[PDB]
Design a protein around this ligand. Structure first.
Ligand SMILES: *[C@@H]1O[C@H](CO)[C@@H](O)[C@H](O)[C@H]1NC(C)=O
Ligand SMILES: *[C@@H]1O[C@H](CO)[C@@H](O)[C@H](O)[C@H]1NC(C)=O
Ligand SMILES: *[C@@H]1O[C@H](CO)[C@@H](O)[C@H](O)[C@H]1NC(C)=O
Ligand SMILES: *[C@@H]1O[C@H](CO)[C@@H](O)[C@H](O)[C@H]1NC(C)=O
Ligand SMILES: *[C@@H]1O[C@H](CO)[C@@H](O)[C@H](O)[C@H]1NC(C)=O
Ligand SMILES: *[C@@H]1O[C@H](CO)[C@@H](O)[C@H](O)[C@H]1NC(C)=O
Lengths: 285, 298, 50
């Protein structure tokens, strides 16, 4: 639906360091308290409660913010591309066994490009059982893969505690990804806390993108009667999507150099004052 | 009192700093192989995301006949260029003359050609040990019977039977109707011009897309406590580099001041925090009692 | 070459880590390459007196 992002979308576009000072800089930040779309990776199993199949195509207008409150560890990747077809080159992200398999390999993006995890019997743990994501011409001009083969599911059904935040932004094709891993406790909505967003990698493939979608897992164990897409009852997370807009903001660094608080320049009158004065606090006048 | 100039101490030495050479592009691997693409279906390898190399000329292939047509071989490590195409196949030595722009022959007729505005490097080296089969190898097929002619950047893989004199062929191979494919002798006992020769052609764009490929960056070792002319990856300038305690965050790579003057940097390869203290910039004032009689000055 | 000077050094250039003493070969070619001119060639290769 529509939700209030209290303070999310703050990061370091410049690699430089400033201690215990402020800096007014213009960049594709996410406007504060803007409309944020809430998507609900939940498996309501009531006979009159439809399976919440929250996976439509989302517009990649300027730069995509992304927050994921996941503790079931189901929401995985990001599907990119203007045409979302094998004809025009595109980008795809997947995170299988803590392995990012970023590729320009524009496969077929039919309505089931998803993962599926099943609790196997040969080994008593949820082992990957579905890879229905790729079947098309490869013709890959780029292939980057880091290969740490681990797993950190730690699925909980009651309280959300792990929040992963990512911002994907394109600048002259240097497709930058900024990431943050936060142990949280709020279950209802995004906590009213301040957290920077360190960059992860700027993939310089220079791919022309307008479309954006999300990647999760859909298969389930054997105790649930039925099949993967017909019966699924372990997706128990949520995520939120906002769109960055071209704005000038202000950042208040600390001695260490971590962004403790930001101030929009175009939110409110007091915000404008704290902007133009180049000060985090202003006296009467 | 008066003022004349500045005590601008001249920088003592130049130092360039760049990170490790972590990635490389396997040119040596693609030079030699047990098997190689036929001249008909030549290999159009897509080279990108790798650091180019210009180590030496007489390499594993010994670079028998080398020529960078449109670009400088000397600054290959220095010239920065992207989207390399390795258009490589197997030919005869006498066919090596068919590489220059507009050169004719059977390769240009039916197998491979090169344009007239080339900007890459062509290497044709004698494969007298790589491809030479003691009994002669004929698997490097070449098309020789085809109605039309092929233009560069076009690879053909079909085997449409040739029709001579517009005589209808029902898949029949006979008089004035041959199989378009034929085979090369390539015997070791052949002459130098008849020796098997392999060609690798490196064609690439000049900064059309983001430059994924760029040559290696030599990193001279830093020297501290001098007015070094430093050139790190991001910036260049002059200053004296000193060890410090600033805890640069792992993603953070520069450090600045309130008035946006870069003074703090991190070592490119290792994790060292340097402060770029200024060099002497004091005005050279002069004091004097007076011009005449006393010429004493300080 | 610096402006306003003509330098004619007949010596073959030295490249390829080998001092070539007037020997044409690999990494050493005669530095005064000749214009490729066919009588009445294309416009880009018709000699112009300047
Ligand atoms: C979301 O948009 C609606 C549309 O009017 C608006 O009423 C609501 O305040 C918005 N929520 C925000 C800006 O957080
Ligand atoms: C595949 O990549 C090549 C790169 O040379 C490109 O020319 C071609 O359009 C791409 N697509 C297909 C279907 O071949
Ligand atoms: C998208 O970017 C690619 C990058 O090469 C370019 O070729 C293409 O024309 C662009 N699309 C449009 C509609 O301009
Ligand atoms: C900086 O990091 C240190 C690391 O221990 C921490 O104790 C401190 O609270 C942080 N902030 C400041 C302002 O020092
Ligand atoms: C090429 O030669 C090198 C020796 O420098 C060798 O290590 C490599 O395996 C060879 N590659 C082939 C034969 O494909
Ligand atoms: C890079 O080179 C430095 C030498 O200053 C060395 O300490 C470091 O281990 C190297 N890193 C890699 C990844 O090779």
């Amino acid at each position: 639906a529509y939700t209030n992002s209290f303070t999310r979308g703050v990061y370091y576009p410049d690699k430089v360091f400033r201690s215990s000072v402020l800096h007014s800089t213009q960049d594709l930040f996410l406007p504060f308290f803007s409309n944020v779309t809430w998507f609900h990776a939940i498996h309501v199993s009531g006979t009159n409660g439809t399976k919440r199949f929250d996976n439509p195509v989302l517009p990649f207008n300027d730069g995509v913010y992304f927050a994921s409150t996941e503790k079931s560890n189901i929401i995985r990747g990001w599907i990119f591309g203007t045409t979302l077809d094998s004809k025009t080159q595109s980008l795809l992200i997947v995170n299988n066994a803590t392995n990012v398999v970023i590729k320009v390999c524009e496969f077929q993006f039919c309505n089931d490009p998803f993962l599926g995890v099943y609790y196997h019997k040969n080994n008593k743990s949820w082992m990957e059982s579905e890879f229905r994501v790729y079947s098309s011409a490869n013709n890959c001009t780029f292939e980057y893969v880091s290969q740490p083969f681990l797993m950190d599911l730690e699925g909980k059904q009651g309280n959300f505690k792990n929040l992963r935040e990512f911002v994907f932004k394109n600048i002259d094709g240097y497709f930058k990804i900024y990431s943050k891993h936060t142990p949280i406790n709020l279950v209802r909505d995004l906590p009213q806390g301040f957290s920077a967003l360190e960059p992860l990698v700027d993939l310089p493939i220079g791919i022309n993108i307008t479309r954006f979608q999300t990647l999760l897992a859909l298969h389930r164990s054997y105790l649930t009667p039925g099949d993967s897409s017909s019966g699924w009852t372990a997706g128990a997370a949520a995520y939120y999507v906002g769109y960055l807009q071209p704005r000038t903001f202000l950042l208040k660094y600390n001695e260490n150099g971590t962004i403790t608080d930001a101030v929009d320049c175009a939110l409110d009158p007091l915000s404008e004052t704290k902007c133009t004065l180049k000060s985090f606090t202003v006296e009467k006048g | 009192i008066y003022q004349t100039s500045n005590f601008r101490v001249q920088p003592t030495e130049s130092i360039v700093r760049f990170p490790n050479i972590t990635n490389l592009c396997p040119f040596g691997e693609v030079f030699n192989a047990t098997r190689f693409a036929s001249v008909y279906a030549w290999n159009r390898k897509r080279i990108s995301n790798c650091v180019a190399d210009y180590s030496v000329l007489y390499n594993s292939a010994s670079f028998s006949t080398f020529k960078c047509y449109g670009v400088s071989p000397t600054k290959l490590n220095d010239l920065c260029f992207t989207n390399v195409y390795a258009d490589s196949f197997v030919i005869r030595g006498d066919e090596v003359r068919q590489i220059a722009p507009g050169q004719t022959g059977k390769i240009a007729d039916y197998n491979y050609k090169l344009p007239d505005d080339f900007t890459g490097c062509v290497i044709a080296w004698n494969s007298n040990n790589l491809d030479s089969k003691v009994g002669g190898n004929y698997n490097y097929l070449y098309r020789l019977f085809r109605k039309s002619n092929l233009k560069p950047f076009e690879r053909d893989i079909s085997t449409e039977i040739y029709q001579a004199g517009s005589t209808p062929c029902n898949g029949v191979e006979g008089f004035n109707c041959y199989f378009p494919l034929q085979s090369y002798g390539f015997q070791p006992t052949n002459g130098v011009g008849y020796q098997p020769y392999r060609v690798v052609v490196l064609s690439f764009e000049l900064l059309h897309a983001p430059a994924t490929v760029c040559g290696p960056k030599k990193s001279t070792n830093l020297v501290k406590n001098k007015c070094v002319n430093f050139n790190f990856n991001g910036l260049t300038g002059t200053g004296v580099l000193t060890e410090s305690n600033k805890k640069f965050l792992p993603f953070q790579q520069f450090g600045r001041d309130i008035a946006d003057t870069t003074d703090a940097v991190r070592d490119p390869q290792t994790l060292e925090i340097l402060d770029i203290t200024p060099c002497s910039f004091g005005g050279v004032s002069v004091i004097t009692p007076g011009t005449n009689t006393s010429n004493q000055v300080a």
